[PDB]
């Protein structure tokens, strides 16, 4: 599923991400924009660790989900990487909560590069929340 921005905003808020461990909704919307363009089926190969980033949060297979093919890997979220690409982002959100709790918001390099020290208020512009 590719989300519209405000549709995603509403979904992330319903799933308890607004302010979760100090990360505002608009920050999550900026992160997911730059990571995946709001596409739940986004994938990107990471040759540095021969791994793949999956779904709207671009969660990596070396650490956080099982995909079988990744060498020297663990499954921190106890989930198949496929489940992090479901149209229903519930499992993806649960795993993001785990990641941010364990490693902090800086776990997402895309957030550091595009969102940190930027005004991200525009991500909720025109959304009913
Ligand atoms: Na894994």
Swiss-Prot record:
Disulfide bond sites: 6-127, 30-115, 65-81, 77-95
Give the GO molecular function terms: lysozyme activity
What the entry lists under Pfam families is as follows:
Lys
Instruction: Please report the stretch or stretches of sequence annotated as the C-type lysozyme domain.
Output: 1-129
Q: Which InterPro entries does the entry link to? A: Glyco_hydro_22, Glyco_hydro_22_CS, Glyco_hydro_22_lys, Lysozyme-like_dom_sf
The first-level EC class reads hydrolase
* Example of a GO biological process term: digestion
What residues sit in the active site? 35, 53
Report the catalytic activity. Answer: Hydrolysis of (1->4)-beta-linkages between N-acetylmuramic acid and N-acetyl-D-glucosamine residues in a peptidoglycan and between N-acetyl-D-glucosamine residues in chitodextrins
Q: What is its EC number?
A: 3.2.1.17
Question: What does the entry state regarding organ or tissue expression?
Answer: Stomach-specific.
What SMART domains does the record tag this protein with?
LYZ1
Keyword entries, A-Z: Antimicrobial, Bacteriolytic enzyme, Digestion, Disulfide bond, Glycosidase, Hydrolase, Signal
Family named by the database record: Belongs to the glycosyl hydrolase 22 family.
Additional free-text comment from the UniProt record: Lysozyme C is capable of both hydrolysis and transglycosylation; it also shows a slight esterase activity. It acts rapidly on both peptide-substituted and unsubstituted peptidoglycan, and slowly on chitin oligosaccharides. The ruminant gastric lysozymes, which digest symbiotic bacteria coming with cud from the rumen, are much more resistant to inactivation by pepsin than are other lysozymes.
Instruction: Provide the assembly information.
Output: Monomer.
Q: Which PANTHER family match?
A: LYSOZYME C (PTHR11407:SF28)
Query: What functional role does this protein have?
Result: Lysozymes have primarily a bacteriolytic function; those in tissues and body fluids are associated with the monocyte-macrophage system and enhance the activity of immunoagents.
Name of the protein this chain belongs to: Lysozyme C-2
Record organism: Bos taurus (Bovine)
